[model samples]
Target: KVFGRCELAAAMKRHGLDNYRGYSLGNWVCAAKFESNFNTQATNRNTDGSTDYGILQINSRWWCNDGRTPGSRNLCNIPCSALLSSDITASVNCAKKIVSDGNGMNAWVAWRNRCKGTDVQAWIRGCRL
Candidate 1:
């Protein structure tokens, strides 16, 4: 609520999500509750030393190339804060592309959900982009 009331407009502007989607407190809250449970600092492991990283959980090995190392992935490559940076909505866009375009959101979002974050849509069952 603080960030919403405090950084409302800025967050909306930066994300490129529609005003409705922005005002979608459910969406936002849902994203918070479901995706990473709103924990922007979450992270997980491959157990086999061959998987992903941080909240929004980027699999640096395959997608970001940041966590390409085994046993010790690279969180610095795509820190969760990047989701709030300028002209770079990798996390949000990745979610959108999967939700809307049903493109590359797959390989990436899977890594994220595996970490127990919100379930981001990566592909449509039978829809076209």
Candidate 2:
């Protein structure tokens, strides 16, 4: 599923991402825009041979198990395939775990580059959440 900006915002809020760990829903929405354009099945293979999965682009190296990322920790305890599902519970939960691990929102490079210290209100403006 390719989520619209407001759709994704609402979904994230429903999943408890709004103001999570001091990061607003707008920050998450902005990261998703740059990371995967709101595509649920999006995947990106890294130069280090790890793959990122799902809308938020969670990585296989340390988060989810893809069965091919060498030395994967699978800290999220989820299959990478689960991240691609249109039902984003697993993906969002995994993302929450990532942020909770002292990484904050900086766990995603897209967030760091595009959302950090920026006014992301436009990402969720006028959305009735």
Candidate 3:
């Protein structure tokens, strides 16, 4: 796990992502918690033959590569291995691109399933940010 709730809240604030496109930092935090539990090394190969990369679990079919393989889009133009980093800079950039592309956090099933239309404040409740 790369983040405790407070640390991620601080990082998100430092990164200027507390509120992007009307989505709260809480929502993003909830998404990350459910998606990969903030593990930068997380990888989940889906039944679709695609994989979900780190942090936000970006899809290899569209955002990144399988490292040893290619994907459908590579929209972020990065290798999947790069997303699995403690730094998280490239992963955040790629997630921003994904948000800009149209879906916002809707791009993440974890968000849709867990955070969407739900009160997500507890994700950052005691963060002190």
Candidate 4:
């Protein structure tokens, strides 16, 4: 595990995603916190027979191809497994695409379910950004 919120923040900022596409730095961190608990390898199956991938829990219904899901938009044009890696470059790029299109972090069910209307600022607590 990466072990630090600051570490993740650093990476996000370095990738030009700290406040990209109308989402806050805290929104990014907070969503990732709830979505994958900072674990890049995290993957979860949804009731709709789709899967969420990586730190941002991107859905196979659009972002990437999971193979099991049919007719995926594959908007990011990446493999679902790529999001599961410690290297978040591809995943972050995909996330940028996702948010830039619309709705910001609300695109993630985890954000709507957990981080929405919560203490977004606290997600960056103790982090030097």
After superposing candidate 2, which stretches have Cα over 4 Å from the reference? none
Of 2 and 3, the candidate ranking higher by TM-score: 2
* Candidate models: Cα lDDT each: 0.40, 0.93, 0.83, 0.86
The most accurate candidate by lDDT is 2
Q: What TM-score would every model get versus the actual structure?
A: 0.41, 0.97, 0.91, 0.91
Candidate 1 residue pairs that clash: 34-118, 35-118, 36-117, 36-118, 60-67
- lDDT (Cα, tens digit) per residue for candidate 1, span 8-125: 3345345764333223322333333333443445556566554433334544443444334545433334543454333335655544433443333233443335422433232111
Query: What does the lDDT read for residue 55 in candidate 4?
Result: 89
Comparing 2 and 4 by TM-score, which wins?
A: 2
Q: Judged by TM-score, which candidate is best? A: 2
Candidate 1: list runs displaced more than 4 Å: 1-14, 18-25, 48-55, 67-88, 97-129
User: Is candidate 1 or 4 superior in TM-score?
Assistant: 4
Global lDDT of model 1: 0.40
Worst 10 residues of 4 by lDDT: 1-10
**Model 1: which ten-residue window has the lowest total lDDT?**
120-129
Ordering by lDDT? 2, 4, 3, 1
Q: Judged by lDDT relative to the true structure, which candidate is superior, 1 or 3?
A: 3
List ranges where model 3 is wrong by over 4 Å.
Answer: 67-71
